[PDB]
Amino acid sequence: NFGAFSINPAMMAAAQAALQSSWGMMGMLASQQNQS
Amino acid sequence: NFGAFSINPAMMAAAQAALQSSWGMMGMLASQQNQS
Amino acid sequence: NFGAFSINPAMMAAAQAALQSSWGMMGMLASQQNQS
Amino acid sequence: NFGAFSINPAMMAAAQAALQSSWGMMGMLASQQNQS
Amino acid sequence: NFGAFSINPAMMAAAQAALQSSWGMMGMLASQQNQS
Amino acid sequence: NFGAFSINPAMMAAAQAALQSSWGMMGMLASQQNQS
Amino acid sequence: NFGAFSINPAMMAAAQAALQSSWGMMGMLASQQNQS
Amino acid sequence: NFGAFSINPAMMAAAQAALQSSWGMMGMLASQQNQS
Amino acid sequence: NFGAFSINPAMMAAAQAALQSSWGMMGMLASQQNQS
Amino acid sequence: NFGAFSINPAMMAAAQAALQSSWGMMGMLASQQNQS
């Protein structure tokens, strides 16, 4: 049903630059329940 | 039914620059229930 | 049903640059329950 | 049902650069329960 | 059901560079319970 | 500024019952950037 | 600024019952960047 | 700034009961970057 | 800044009961970068 | 900055009971990088 999901940041820092980044709590989760 | 979802920020910082970014709680989740 | 998900940041630091990054809590998780 | 998920950051540091990175709590986990 | 998941960072450090990295708590874990 | 947030589901299953539940991607995340 | 967050499900299963539950990707994460 | 976060599920199983549970990828993670 | 986080499930199994549980990938992780 | 984190499950099994539990990949990890 579902996809396939890429994550690809480019990230460049020049001469006297300052850069931060962060990622958290990302992904796939699912449930099934099947009863006679 | 569903997709496939890319995430790709470009991010550039010049000479005396300051840059921050953040990401959280992103993804796919689904449920099924199937009963006789 | 689901995908296959790549993660690939490029990351470049110039002459006097400063760069940080971080990642946490990423992946796949699922559940089944099946009862007669 | 599920994928196969690559993780591959490229990471370059120039002449007087400074770079940090981090990763934690990433993977797959699942459950089954099956009762007569 | 599941995948097979590669991890392969490239990592380059130039002349006067400084680079750190880290990884922790990554893998697969699962459970079964089966009752008559 | 913020709270403190409890999560406490009660959950009861009778004689021949069937019950599933799930939770994912829940928490707090924040950012600061402070520049002279 | 922030809280302190309890998680405490009660969970009861009767005579011939069936019950499943799950939790994933929950917690706190934050970032600082401070530049002269 | 942050809390202190308890996790304490109660969990009871009666005579012919069946019960499963699971937890994964939970905790705290943070970053600092400080540049002259 | 941060807490101190207890984990304490109670867990009871009656006469003919069946019970499973699981935990994985839980803890604290952090990073610093400090540059002149 | 951080805590001190207890883990203490209670766990009781009655007359004809069956009980399993598991824990893995739990702890603290951190990084520093400090450059002149």
UniProtKB/Swiss-Prot annotation, chains A, B, C, D, E, F, G, H, I, J:
Localization: Nucleus; Cytoplasm; Cytoplasm, Stress granule; Mitochondrion
Name the reported effect of A4T: In ALS10; triggers mitochondrial DNA release into the cytosol, which is then detected by CGAS, leading to activation of the cGAS-STING pathway and autoinflammation; slight reduction in interaction with PPIA/CYPA
Phenotype for A10V: In ALS10; loss of ability to negatively regulate the expression of CDK6
Q: How is it modified after translation?
A: Hyperphosphorylated in hippocampus, neocortex, and spinal cord from individuals affected with ALS and FTLDU. Phosphorylated upon cellular stress. Ubiquitinated in hippocampus, neocortex, and spinal cord from individuals affected with ALS and FTLDU.
For this UniProt entry, which segments traverse the membrane? Answer: none
Expression tissues: Ubiquitously expressed. In particular, expression is high in pancreas, placenta, lung, genital tract and spleen.
Q: Which disease is it linked to?
A: Amyotrophic lateral sclerosis 10: A neurodegenerative disorder affecting upper motor neurons in the brain and lower motor neurons in the brain stem and spinal cord, resulting in fatal paralysis. Sensory abnormalities are absent. The pathologic hallmarks of the disease include pallor of the corticospinal tract due to loss of motor neurons, presence of ubiquitin-positive inclusions within surviving motor neurons, and deposition of pathologic aggregates. The etiology of amyotrophic lateral sclerosis is likely to be multifactorial, involving both genetic and environmental factors.
Q: Fill in the domain comment.
A: Consists of an N-terminal domain (NTD) and two tandem RNA recognition motifs, RRM1 and RRM2, followed by a C-terminal glycine-rich region. Contains a nuclear localization sequence and is mostly nuclear; however, its nuclear export sequence permits it to transport mRNAs to the cytoplasm and even to synapses as part of neuronal granules.
Chain's role: RNA-binding protein that is involved in various steps of RNA biogenesis and processing. Preferentially binds, via its two RNA recognition motifs RRM1 and RRM2, to GU-repeats on RNA molecules predominantly localized within long introns and in the 3'UTR of mRNAs. In turn, regulates the splicing of many non-coding and protein-coding RNAs including proteins involved in neuronal survival, as well as mRNAs that encode proteins relevant for neurodegenerative diseases. Plays a role in maintaining mitochondrial homeostasis by regulating the processing of mitochondrial transcripts.
Assembly state and interactors? Homodimer. Homooligomer (via its N-terminal domain). Interacts with BRDT. Binds specifically to pyrimidine-rich motifs of TAR DNA and to single stranded TG repeated sequences. Binds to RNA, specifically to UG repeated sequences with a minimum of six contiguous repeats. Interacts with ATXN2; the interaction is RNA-dependent. Interacts with MATR3. Interacts with UBQLN2. Interacts with HNRNPA2B1. Interacts with ZNF106. Interacts with CNOT7/CAF1. Interacts with CRY2.
Q: What is this protein called?
A: TAR DNA-binding protein 43
Organism expressing this protein natively: Homo sapiens
* Full-length numbering of the shown residues: 312 to 347 of 414
